[PDB]
Structures are given as structure tokens and as C-alpha cells.
Swiss-Prot record:
Protein name: Cholinesterase
Organism of derivation: Homo sapiens (Human)
UniProt-reported outcome of changing residue 330 to C: In BCHED; results in 20% of activity compared to wild-type
Recorded consequence of changing residue 240 to M: In BCHED; allele fluoride-1
Residues that hold tacrine according to the record: 79, 435
Tissue expression pattern: Detected in blood plasma (at protein level). Present in most cells except erythrocytes.
Keywords from the named record: Disease variant, Disulfide bond, Glycoprotein, Hydrolase, Phosphoprotein, Secreted, Serine esterase, Sialic acid, Signal
Catalyzed reactions per annotation: an acylcholine + H2O = a carboxylate + choline + H(+)
Cellular location(s): Secreted
Impact reported for residue 327 to I: In BCHED; BChE variant form; fluoride-resistant
Domain of life of the native organism: Eukaryota
Stretches of the chain forming a coiled coil according to its record: none
Sites carrying sugar chains: 14, 54, 103, 238, 253, 338, 452, 478, 482-483
């Protein structure tokens, strides 16, 4: 029940899972609380304690603005924090199998939320099923988000940027120093995340200071090269200065600005965070990762292209309808409560919402490539095209480009295309296989037979859980016992990928080849 860590004893709690037991340690602190003069700084290491820390409930989530677009609707509120918001939020969770393992592989989850939101205590990130079913140890941490985690005066140590990434890193360090006392193997750690968590995982592959802190990596619906994932140093500075203007903290001495922002209440910072972008999008990342010369020594496109990353195996994938969720957060004619048949004019309006800084020719070129169809009279033509535009540009084509570039340096990569819509999905049918709704299958919630998932969904989750655990333990995401389809390595020539669904997994080639030729070759020129 009690485990001695290098900073003090911690007490866990026993959970009953599927007729067995998991030991959960919820809310272990891993840094000094970043309060007062510590706000906006890199996380500081933690002073030893003498008593028994009680890790028996999720800790505070980090300060963040909540989605209030659909009050009372589980489809959006299931992503909102479920613990008190607080700056005192640098805590992590550990699920270990019972009986205690001897040298268990470790899975470390990094949640998404656009680097502005998210928390490890969400129900769909409960690691007790993975620890129980596959006997891995599951670790998850809270890391600072928004301005509090990513405000950047690049080069200034009072606000250097990338603080939430350093929070994540300090938790990986905690696993290296402490997980053996929990029965874990520090030499067998796989990071996984979804995104912004996936984008975070891909940047740990790029950061030399994280290379010794993990073994393998899983990227669900995200990578750093996605257009929403990294802020240029230019916007980063202009966004810091805008927040100072909005808070009345405009000073000349850039350090006096940060001091002024340290005496503001978190709410004042949070409510001003929204309007710092001039023209935002539903996918806007207001304060995100930047090139800081510390965590990220150069522009990450350059690092990827020139092979400057940890050589290891990766598992990468995307969902069939990544873009649809975002259409009801601003695109005209769209609504979760009707079938969202939009016209050509509404589609053109929609592009202006998702490509605010792009020229007319750039938007016309998107329209040209996505509006040549079979039957012109199909009324959902424009509705589906906009979803595909948003999904291809923001998720599928960057993930494929990341995987191609990464595998070109000799490493084994595995790519999946998730295409099962959960039977319990509270969002409407036109949105299909949405962004975020593979997570519950990865974490094995449909293994709980009391949860109104179908039988085929329990099977699919069981297969996915085994593949993910085999990738983490062995670098190879196979399900070897129940004669599953073999998952081939993704090569830059053949570009084979595996489809995940309840009616036969299939090997396919060259996902969205024609669309991604537009987004990766043409569109960055505009
Ligand atoms: C789908 O609904 C949208 C959103 O309208 C709101 O939600 C509905 C469920 C209903 O309660 C409406 O009364 C609400 O206003 C509709 O979008 C509106 O469309 C009209 C006419 O096209 C336009 O004047 C409004 O500005 C739109 N409002 C928006 C975009 O917020 C849309 O027409 C509906 N689609 C279908 C096929 O019925
Ligand atoms: C830390 O926890 C100690 C143990 O309390 C336990 O809690 C209940 C729910 C049962 O599980 C039972 O085993 C114990 O009573 C406390 O005695 C101690 O006060 C706690 N310390 C702090 C600071 O909360
Ligand atoms: C625990 O296991 C260690 C070896 O781990 C294995 O090798 C590394 C390189 C990874 O590929 C990982 O996935 C493997 O599981 C041993 O060196 C170590 O001595 C073991 N310690 C104990 C206490 O059993
Ligand atoms: C594999 O399947 C188990 C039950 O299926 C039965 O056993 C397999 C070996 C086949 O013979 C099949 O025809 C049988 O119906 C599940 O209990 C188990 O969880 C499955 N494992 C995975 C990893 O999916
Ligand atoms: C980015 N959206 C995420 C919501 C969905 C929920 C279900 C699918 C899976 C998770 C993502 C919300 C949002 C944050 N900021 C916004 C902004 O500025 C304008 C408009 C919208 C937003
Ligand atoms: C940030 O950029 C916008 C857009 O050009 C500009 O209007 C604004 O002045 C900039 N912020 C500052 C503090 O200059
Ligand atoms: C601003 O920061 C501190 C003030 O406490 C000090 O280094 C100095 O007065 C200022 N530095 C510059 C470069 O203006
Ligand atoms: Cl201060
Ligand atoms: Cl909950
Ligand atoms: Cl089994
Ligand atoms: Cl498809
Ligand atoms: Cl299956
Ligand atoms: Cl082919
Ligand atoms: Cl395709
Ligand atoms: Na397709």
C-alpha cells in the first residue's frame, strides 16, 4: 500500500477491476508548485517530505478556460476539467498491477487540449484498465497550459516559453528516478498522447534533454508539424505583448512586464488569453510550444527534415473524420442538432473561418481541389468537403508527413487509420468517427461490460489494447494469438497502414495521397 520514493513515502489505494486489483496512486507531486515568483518559470525540483503523502484522489487540474459552447451536453463537457483548477497542479498519477510487478513496461500518457486545456484526471484517461489487463504501469501528469504554461519572452528566463513541455519532462524524469520502486522498468517507457499530447510526444522525440527519458512513442491524432501545433517566435512575442496590453502590464523593461503579470490573479490572465490572437480559428492555439533555444534548439521542421531526433520505433495514426468536431465551433450552417447541410456559399464562408490569414487565391485553391465530385446533386457534398478539408490539413497530412520523414532515417514506424464510430457517441451521425473518440478504446473502457458498448466494441478495444501494449513492451504492435492481421511497417515507398474497425482490419496503401499532395506540396507555398 505504501511505496518509498526518493522524496518521501506515498500511500496508494486499492481498486477492484474486472475481478482483480489495481493499485492507484493519484496525485503524487513532482515539482514545486509554480506560484508567486515561480509563475511562468521552468518547474523547480521538489523538496523532500518526511510523512506519508496520501495519493488517494486526483489533484488540482491546471488553470484553464472551460468549453462553455454546449452547456449540459456530455459530448463537450466530458473534456472539461473534473477537479478544482489551481496553479498548484504539478502532480502525476500511477496505476500499477496487483500483485506488484517485477519489471513492468511503463506507459506515460500526455493529454491533449491544444496546449490551452486538458487534465490527466479525465475518465477517458483512467489507466486502471491497462494496468489490469496488460500488466503495464500507466503514468499520467498534469502540465501547465495556456499562457501559464507557454507564455514566451524567448531568451528571458522569467518567461522563456515551453514551461508546460518542461513540466512534462520533469515528470518523465520522476519516472526514471522512481518507477523501479513501483515495480516499473525505467528502461522500458513508452510515451503516448493525443492531439496536443501527441504533438508533445513528437517534440520529446526532438528534444535532446528528453532522449534518455523514454524508449518508444505513440502519436494519436497529432504531431508537431500540424499547422496548429507550434507558434513562431514572432507570434509568441506579439501574443505576450498583447496580453500585457490587455492586462495593463505594458512596460518597457520586458522583465518588469513579467513581474506585473505575476501579480495578476489567474482569472485575469485566463479571460484575456482568448483575444490575444487577431483572427483566431476553432483550432487556435493561443499560447503553445515555441523555439526557445532550450527544449527546442531550432525550428522543428528543420530538425525532422535533417534527421535530428531520437532513433526509435513510433506508432502513429488518425481517425476517419478528424475535422468534423471543429465545424460546429464557428462554421456557418453547422450545428450538432441538425444534419448541417451547407451551401457552396457557406462552404466558402467556412474556409474563411479556418484559414483566416490565407489569400483569396489560397482559399479558391482549397475549393478547387475539394469540390470536384461524383454526383453534384448530393446535398451533403459541401458539408463533407469542409470536414475533410479541416481533417486533412490539420491532422491526416501532417501525421503522414511526420511518419514518412521519421521512417526515412531507418526506424520502424506503424501507421493506423481508426474508422469505428463509438456506439455511445453523443454527437450527431454526420460527424462520423470524430477526433478524440479513439481514446476510450485505447484505454479499454469498452472492456467494462457494464458500459453499454457493443460486443464488437469490446473485441476491438481488446485488440487495440494488446497492440498498444505489445508496441510498448516489444516495439511491434501485433496481436499474435487470435490470428489478427499483421500490421506491416510503414515504409516511405509503399506507405502501408492498418485500418482499425469492428469488421476486419485491412492493410491499405497511401492514405489520402491526392489530398495530401495538395496540402504538403502546393499549399505551404501560398
Ligand atoms: C442547422 O442549425 C443551424 C444553427 O441554427 C441554430 O440551431 C438550430 C438547431 C435551431 O435551433 C436554430 O433556430 C438556431 O438558430 C442553422 O444555421 C442558421 O441558418 C440560418 C438560415 O440558413 C441563418 O440565418 C443563421 O445565421 C444560421 N445560424 C448559425 C449558422 O449559427 C442551419 O440553417 C441549420 N441547418 C439545417 C439543414 O437545418
Ligand atoms: C493520510 O492517510 C492516513 C490514512 O487514512 C486512511 O484513510 C481511510 C479512508 C482508510 O483508508 C484508512 O485506512 C485510513 O484511516 C490518515 O490517517 C492521515 O491523517 C492522512 N494524512 C493527511 C495529511 O491527510
Ligand atoms: C529490468 O529490465 C532491464 C532490461 O529492460 C529491457 O531492455 C531495454 C533496453 C528495453 O528494450 C526494455 O523494453 C526491456 O524490457 C534489465 O537490464 C534490468 O536489470 C531489469 N531489472 C530488474 C530489477 O528486473
Ligand atoms: C482472443 O480471443 C479470446 C476468446 O476467443 C476465443 O479464443 C481464441 C484463441 C480463438 O480460439 C477464438 O475463436 C475463441 O472464441 C478472448 O478472450 C481474448 O481476449 C482475445 N485476445 C485478444 C488479444 O484480443
Ligand atoms: C478546440 N475546441 C475543442 C472542442 C472539441 C470537443 C469534442 C471533440 C474532441 C475535442 C475537441 C474548443 C475551442 C477551444 N477554443 C476555441 C475557440 O477559440 C473558438 C472556438 C472553439 C474553441
Ligand atoms: C500584434 O499583431 C497585430 C496584427 O498586426 C497588431 O495590430 C498589434 O499591434 C500587435 N501587437 C503589438 C503589441 O504590437
Ligand atoms: C530590467 O530588469 C531588472 C529590473 O529589476 C534589471 O536587470 C534592469 O533594471 C532591467 N534590465 C534592462 C536590460 O533594462
Ligand atoms: Cl513577483
Ligand atoms: Cl468524470
Ligand atoms: Cl487474454
Ligand atoms: Cl475515407
Ligand atoms: Cl477486432
Ligand atoms: Cl499502392
Ligand atoms: Cl484515401
Ligand atoms: Na479514404
Amino acid at each position: 500500500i505504501i511505496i518509498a520514493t526518493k522524496n518521501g513515502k506515498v500511500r496508494g489505494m486499492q481498486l477492484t477491476v474486472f475481478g482483480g486489483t489495481v493499485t492507484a496512486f493519484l496525485g503524487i507531486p513532482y515539482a514545486q508548485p509554480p506560484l508567486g515568483r515561480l509563475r511562468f518559470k521552468k518547474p523547480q525540483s521538489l523538496t523532500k517530505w518526511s510523512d506519508i503523502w496520501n495519493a488517494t484522489k486526483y489533484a488540482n487540474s491546471c488553470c484553464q478556460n472551460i468549453d462553455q459552447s454546449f452547456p449540459g451536453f456530455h459530448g463537450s463537457e466530458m473534456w472539461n476539467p473534473n477537479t478544482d483548477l489551481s496553479e498548484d497542479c504539478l502532480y502525476l498519477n500511477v496505476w500499477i498491477p496487483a500483485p506488484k510487478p517485477k519489471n513492468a513496461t511503463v506507459l506515460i500518457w500526455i493529454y491533449g487540449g491544444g496546449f490551452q486545456t486538458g487534465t490527466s484526471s479525465l475518465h477517458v484517461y483512467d489507466g486502471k484498465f491497462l494496468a489490469r489487463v496488460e500488466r503495464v504501469i500507466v503514468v499520467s501528469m498534469n502540465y501547465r497550459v495556456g499562457a501559464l504554461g507557454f507564455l514566451a519572452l524567448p531568451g528571458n528566463p522569467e518567461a522563456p516559453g515551453n514551461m508546460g513541455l518542461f513540466d512534462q519532462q520533469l515528470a518523465l524524469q520522476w519516472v526514471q528516478k522512481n518507477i523501479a520502486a513501483f515495480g516499473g522498468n525505467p528502461k522500458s517507457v513508452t510515451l503516448f498522447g493525443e492531439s496536443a499530447g501527441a504533438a508533445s510526444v513528437s517534440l520529446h522525440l526532438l528534444s535532446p534533454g528528453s532522449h534518455s527519458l523514454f524508449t518508444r512513442a505513440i502519436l494519436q491524432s497529432g504531431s508537431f508539424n500540424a499547422p496548429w501545433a507550434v507558434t513562431s517566435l514572432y507570434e509568441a512575442r506579439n501574443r505576450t505583448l498583447n496580453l500585457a496590453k490587455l492586462t495593463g502590464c505594458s512596460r518597457e523593461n520586458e522583465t518588469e512586464i513579467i513581474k506585473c503579470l505575476r501579480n495578476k490573479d489567474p482569472q485575469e490572465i485566463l479571460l484575456n488569453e482568448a483575444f490575444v490572437v487577431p483572427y483566431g480559428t476553432p483550432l487556435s492555439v493561443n499560447f503553445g510550444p515555441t523555439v526557445d533555444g532550450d527544449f527546442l534548439t531550432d525550428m522543428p521542421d528543420i530538425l525532422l527534415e535533417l534527421g535530428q531526433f531520437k532513433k526509435t520505433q513510433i506508432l502513429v495514426g488518425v481517425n476517419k473524420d478528424e475535422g468534423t468536431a471543429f465545424l460546429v465551433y464557428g462554421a456557418p450552417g453547422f450545428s450538432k442538432d441538425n444534419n448541417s447541410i451547407i451551401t457552396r456559399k457557406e462552404f466558402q464562408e467556412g474556409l474563411k473561418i479556418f484559414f483566416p490569414g490565407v489569400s483569396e487565391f489560397g482559399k479558391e485553391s482549397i475549393l478547387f481541389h475539394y469540390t470536384d465530385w461524383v454526383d453534384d446533386q448530393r446535398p451533403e457534398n459541401y458539408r463533407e468537403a469542409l470536414g475533410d478539408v479541416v481533417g486533412d490539413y490539420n491532422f491526416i497530412c501532417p501525421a503522414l508527413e511526420f511518419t514518412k520523414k521519421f521512417s526515412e532515417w531507418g526506424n520502424n514506424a506503424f501507421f493506423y487509420y481508426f474508422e469505428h464510430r463509438s456506439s455511445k457517441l453523443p454527437w450527431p451521425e454526420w460527424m462520423g468517427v470524430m477526433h478524440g473518440y479513439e481514446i476510450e478504446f485505447v484505454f479499454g473502457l469498452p472492456l467494462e461490460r457494464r458500459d453499454q458498448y457493443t460486443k464488437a466494441e469490446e473485441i476491438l478495444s481488446r485488440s487495440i489494447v494488446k497492440r498498444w501494449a505489445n508496441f510498448a513492451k516489444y516495439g511491434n504492435p501485433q496481436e499474435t494469438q487470435n490470428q489478427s492481421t499483421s500490421w506491416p511497417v510503414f515504409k516511405s515507398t509503399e506507405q502501408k497502414y492498418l485500418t482499425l474497425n469492428t469488421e476486419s482490419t485491412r492493410i491499405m496503401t497511401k492514405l489520402r495521397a491526392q489530398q495530401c499532395r495538395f496540402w504538403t506540396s502546393f499549399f505551404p507555398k501560398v
